């Protein structure tokens, strides 16, 4: 089947289409104005793989956390796209997406995701890929102050890969914790990494109707 | 046939559905966050008239002028909705929409539309309904300084109905011009008034594909 993923949760916007494993994706840093770029990206990606919106089985959307406005804009477009085509929707975490990206690029299986939320906050998550490739640790997603993150890091063990803008925003985090951290090579989520996660949810039937697609509230 | 109109160009957001003349509409003042309200409004309206998105013949969208961000958000959702359903799109002017509203509520046939654009500017238009009900004067749409509007008013004649927030923002306009002005009873556009205009365009085949739907640039 086919899965179309869309992400506009952060400073970047991206689209990806999954077709029996074969991926078609596009990623670009999105200005303070995302909306104007999604639709064209979507139509390009669909055309590239010779697919119609009505031929897609599910539409994966970025449920955040991240930009309050950006996350909601993306969900809005996604719903529009899914409603007009009667498509089931799949919410995917921005933090989990970056973790999958770390696995894709560096083979990391334990990811500490930290997003530099404005005004001194950070969106945090501790993700660990299990044997079936499902990222465990969604219950750890939270919005914390740098200080509490530093506190959290002292309770962790084993090695981890770091992903997200939060690390460069608060360089003391990786420095003061006694953990062995590796660079996940992921600063921002990419729709292409949303696909593997959306597919596993589809396989389990964890989808939502258009009217129930919403942003995560941490 | 059926026409679905959506407007989020100004401080208000609205949706309306035309079914062989029978209208179903909803209007509400939209906060600094519109996106979150459109989809539900759309699904409500479609359900109320027992219609599916795929049963609609055209999707009318607010092409502005108005909020730079608001206008683009609306177009984005509309495109999403139209693409997933393979629907032809119809751009409708925010100023013309308010003029149609004035005709609906007061029978006005000559409308001076003025929108209070931020930072001391005003979106302006001189609209006149012809015998077939088509609003002539689209070529007059422009972004002007209050002073130039006052200047423009001195070149006009006959009576006019006033619509838009621009009049209350610059009360000297109606006071210093020698024109007989009547209250159009319309401060903000309503999707329901976009319908008659979208229908005439549909009848003439003046529609655009999803990828060509864009905001007006004054």
Swiss-Prot record, chains A, B:
CDD domains from the UniProt entry: ASKHA_NBD_TsaB (cd24032)
Chain segments annotated as transmembrane: none
Similarity annotation: Belongs to the KAE1 / TsaD family. TsaB subfamily.
Location(s), subcellular: Cytoplasm
GO aspect biological process, one term: tRNA threonylcarbamoyladenosine modification
Keywords, in A-Z order: Cytoplasm, tRNA processing
Entry's Gene Ontology cellular component terms: cytosol
Keyword match tRNA processing: yes
Source species of the chain: Salmonella typhimurium (strain LT2 / SGSC1412 / ATCC 700720)
Name the UniProt record assigns to this protein: tRNA threonylcarbamoyladenosine biosynthesis protein TsaB
